[PDB]
Amino acid sequence: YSGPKLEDGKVTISFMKELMQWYKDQKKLHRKCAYQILVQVKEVLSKLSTLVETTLKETEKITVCGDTHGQFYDLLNIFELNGLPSETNPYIFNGDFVDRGSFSVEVILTLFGFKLLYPDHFHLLRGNHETDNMNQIYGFEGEVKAKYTAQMYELFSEVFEWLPLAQCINGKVLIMHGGLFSEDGVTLDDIRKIERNRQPPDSGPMCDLLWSDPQPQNGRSISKRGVSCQFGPDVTKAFLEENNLDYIIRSHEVKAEGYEVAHGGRCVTVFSAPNYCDQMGNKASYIHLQGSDLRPQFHQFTAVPHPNVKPMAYA
Ligand SMILES: C[C@]1(C(=O)O)[C@@H]2CC[C@@H](O2)[C@@]1(C)C(=O)O
Ligand SMILES: [Mn+2]
Ligand SMILES: [Mn+2]
């Protein structure tokens, strides 16, 4: 084995750079190193609240990314356009790191490595795809079994259970993968109190956070997805007012331009998988926020080349 090795059993910046190059060249991280990243990140994530609360000082910035879906070569492109993660270049990845794309192992181990390296400045939120039922169908379980073992997949599944469900910046911007709720009156403290170390329920707040979508018309509708609901601008307005928030950032839907701003400014969608599944032809985006100005600034980007592996190859 001539690949990346941890230093004294821990992730370092040189390890991360080595890992990204190793993965770019389509090589596999040693199972023992992969194992170590997973057990260590499980410990880090298990200490976090279900609602991560982050302060951004006046001069501080953060980058919010949406779905990446195993598009490892596009993930590297994000880091090239926007710089590597660091204490002065923080990131939030808003779920759906795996499935669909066929470099999910590479995406997720890279993200977990950066979580270990910069735990206070690199944030991962759970998506609907960081769950067993979805992984079984949409490629990740198959990919892990092909590259490693069923045992390794079990460990991934356990780590995903500890991913936080939402993040609030400066008490003003709430970020979650899916969206708001099937019932009125859900509070930030309700989110904090969700016992999240589980596969999501078929209904209720944990489900909604991972699964819901905005709709343009007032009210709520039964979701076309078969789970959770669609929520109108009245739902968002009420939730924001009750919780003293300005707006929400969510992901979970492909958008041709990589982003959308719905509900009169109140519900932003960011999607970070360009040319999704090598078919959709969409742009992707990420968002910059600054402590001095929490209004979203969108940065669009397009797909870059990847190796000759089809989406869903491992499903
Ligand atoms: C189809 C998608 C997925 O399966 O994750 C994929 C394409 C849009 C968005 O990401 C999606 C609808 C989602 O549920 O997150
Ligand atoms: Mn998705
Ligand atoms: Mn999703």
Describe it for me?
Substrate binds at residues 69, 100, 128-129, 225, 252. Belongs to the PPP phosphatase family. PP-5 (PP-T) subfamily. One of its GO terms (molecular function) is mitogen-activated protein kinase kinase kinase binding. It is an enzyme of class 3 (hydrolase). The chain has helices at 13-24, 31-46, 72-82, 104-117, 132-138, 140-147, 150-160, 188-193, 205-211, 233-242; strands at residues 51-54, 61-65, 91-94, 122-125, 166-169, 173-176, 213-214, 220-222, 229-231, 247-250, 259-262, 267-270, 284-290, 293-301. It has 315 residues and is of the alpha/beta class. It has one domain (1-315): Purple Acid Phosphatase, chain A, domain 2. α3 links the parallel β2 and β3. α1 (13-24) packs antiparallel against α4 (104-117) and α2 packs across α4. The longest helix is centred in the first third of the chain and has 16 residues, at 31-46. The relative contact order is 0.16.
Broad shape? globular
> What is the total domain count?
1
- The whole-angstrom Rg is 18 Å
Structural class: alpha/beta
Write down the CATH topology.
Purple Acid Phosphatase, chain A, domain 2
Total count of strands: 14
CATH homologous superfamily (4th level) name: Metallo-dependent phosphatases
Small-molecule binders here are: the ligand C[C@]1(C(=O)O)[C@@H]2CC[C@@H](O2)[C@@]1(C)C(=O)O, manganese (II) ion
Cα separation of the termini: 28 Å
Order of helices and strands: HHEEHEHEHHHEEHHEEEHEEEEE
The neighbouring-strand order within the major sheet is 1-5-6-10-12-11
The percentage of residues in β strands lies in 15-25%
CATH top level class name: Alpha Beta
Give the count of helical stretches: 10
Binding site for Mn(2+) 1: 67, 69, 96
Binding site for substrate: 69, 100, 128-129, 225, 252
Main location: nucleus
EC number: 3.1.3.16
